[PDB]
């Protein structure tokens, strides 16, 4: 079997992406946010906290004639941002774009944090990282992909987000009209839970490529691209006016500025983020200085390749027994 859904960003900065998914029976649509970083399906539902819905697509477990309590399960996730979730737990039918997964754990939350709350289009999220870092208690659940993944025609999925423009996730094969050259595979690490993968260096704009090992993430969940100190400052010198602000809390660029490209490296392949995909506009409206999208990772712990990076690149999530990441032009 195969799977394939259209991504589109939830604004025009693409802070995030959203993702139709059928929940239930009969079919209930909520917009879920692909998640390569966390392992949890958890949707906004009407076991939420009242006052912590604020127009989001609830999921009504009394109304799927295929939900099930999971008895005694109860989950609570914190993310890397600061924003956290918690609920109970049904079995039930989820779909994504054709592909079918009959009994998978929907985590239905009782508390959302404020940034939730505050973002009306996103009805939960969907994780794509491995089961390991499945937060349900007692008993771990396994994500939609590896619940799919004996069925699937090819044990991957992609991720082929657009810039200020929708994008696709397929499930079960890859699309080889989607991007431009070869894809080109490295290594994962699976031990920390995420899709950890070693980038080869590093260039800004038209200048040198620095050959460095860079550990970090892919991860469709988090916004922006987040590199060690030195290579942050390193591409922010390029950009008149660019300063690190701690009032806003990372980079800032004057709005007027053309930004220079940066490239990171998979294997002996280059994947050229184009300048403008930097540009996360005014850091408070009305503002002339614009918020960068390269940011530190020296506060985190873990350096994190971001929708700023994954959207520049075709990227295949491979699943396969010693899973590996490849990444195309396109
Ligand atoms: N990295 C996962 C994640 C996804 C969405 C959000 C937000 F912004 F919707 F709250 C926070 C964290």
């Known amino acids: 079997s195969t799977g394939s859904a259209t991504t589109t960003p939830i604004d025009s900065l693409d802070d995030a992406y959203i993702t139709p998914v059928q929940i239930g029976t009969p079919a209930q649509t909520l917009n879920l946010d692909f998640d390569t970083g966390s392992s949890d399906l958890w949707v906004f539902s009407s076991e939420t906290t009242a006052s912590e819905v604020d127009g989001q697509t609830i999921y009504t477990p009394s109304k799927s004639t295929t939900a099930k309590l999971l008895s005694g399960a109860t989950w609570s996730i914190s993310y890397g941002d600061g924003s956290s979730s918690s609920g109970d737990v049904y079995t039930d039918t989820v779909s994504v774009g054709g592909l079918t997964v009959t009994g998978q754990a929907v985590e239905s939350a009782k508390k959302v944090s404020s940034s939730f709350t505050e973002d009306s289009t996103i009805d939960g ?70 899709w950890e993968w070693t980038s080869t260096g590093y260039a800004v704009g038209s200048g040198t490529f620095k050959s460095t090992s860079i550990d970090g993430i892919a991860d469709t969940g988090t916004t922006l691209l987040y590199l060690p100190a030195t290579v942050v400052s390193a591409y922010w010198a390029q950009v008149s006016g660019a300063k690190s602000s701690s009032s806003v809390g990372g980079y800032v660029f004057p709005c007027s500025a053309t930004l220079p490209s940066f490239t990171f490296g998979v294997g002996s392949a280059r994947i050229v983020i184009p300048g403008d995909y930097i540009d996360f506009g005014p850091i408070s409206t009305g503002s002339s200085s614009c918020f960068g999208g390269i940011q530190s990772s020296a506060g985190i712990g873990i350096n994190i390749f971001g929708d700023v990076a994954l959207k520049a690149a075709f990227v295949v999530f491979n699943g396969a027994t010693t899973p590996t990441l490849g990444f195309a032009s396109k």
């Open 125 to 194: 999220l969907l994780g794509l990282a491995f089961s390991t870092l499945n937060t349900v208690s007692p008993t771990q659940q396994k994500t939609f992909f590896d619940n799919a993944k004996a069925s699937l025609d090819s044990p991957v999925f992609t991720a082929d987000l657009g810039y200020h423009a929708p994008g696709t996730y397929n499930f079960g094969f890859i699309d080889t009209t989607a991007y431009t050259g070869s894809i080109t595979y490295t290594a994962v690490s699976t031990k920390q839970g995420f």
